[PDB]
Amino acid sequence: AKATTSVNYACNLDKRLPELPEGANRAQILESTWSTEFKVYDSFGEAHELQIDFARVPGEVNAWRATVNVDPTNADATATRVGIGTTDGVQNSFIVRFDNNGHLASVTDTAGNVTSPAGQVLVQISYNVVGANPDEAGAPTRHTFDVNLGEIGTSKNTITQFSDKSTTKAYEQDGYT
């Protein structure tokens, strides 16, 4: 068995889900949310479910907050963190923004770190491996990998916001049980 180091992931987020005003209530936000899940694998032979909830941002067009949790039924314990170029100083969500043609434009983590204006977009993920010994520095053992969301401004194998069904269009990675 062997650990996920990188996930090639892409989805379409249905542009037809209503845009949200700043004051939107919980149910309006849920109507404009699409959730998905895929597996990642730690270094010790265990598959973990990674859940992403993509919800439109109230008061901003063409912008979705993706909230990520590994082991979503034990999410406090895994303390999932997501960031651009880091997993320090961040929580577990990022805002993905699309241009006016529905193509990926930017990703920003909760510390405000943002993707370069062009190129491939990698989101760093880390989470506590529950039940594991700490590392040799005594720090809790964490599984760190990246998620490649595709190439800014392009559709192929890249997250998009088209007026079509929300769906996964790419998932492949290098870990296994």
SS3 state at 86: coil
CA 24 to the chain's CA centroid = 23
What three-state secondary structure class fits 27? Answer: helix
* Consecutive H or E run containing 71: none
User: Furthest-apart CA pair in the chain: how many Å?
Assistant: 50
Note whether 65 and 95 are within 8 A (CB): yes
Radius of gyration of the chain (CA): 16
Closest-CA residue to 104 (of 58, 49, 147, 40): 147
Q: Where are the domains of the chain?
A: 1-177
Strand extents, DSSP E, the chain: 6-12, 33-41, 47-56, 63-70, 81-83, 93-98, 104-109, 120-128, 142-151, 167-173
* Nearest by Cα to 172 from 160, 157, 161: 157
Strand partners, 161: none
Residue 28 near residue 18 (C-beta atoms within 8 A): yes
CA atoms of 103 and 161, how far apart (whole Å): 6
Phi, psi at residue 120, to the nearest 5°?
-75, 145
